[PDB]
Design a protein around this nucleic acid. Sequence first.
DNA 1: ACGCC
Length: 18
Amino acid sequence: VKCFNCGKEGHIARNCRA
DNA sequence: ACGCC
Ligand SMILES: [Zn+2]
């Protein structure tokens, strides 16, 4: 499943960084 | 930013 803050694989929106 | 993993 994919991060949606960035759109990369693995990690969460909430913990993203962009 | 939110949700899930
Ligand atoms: Zn991300």
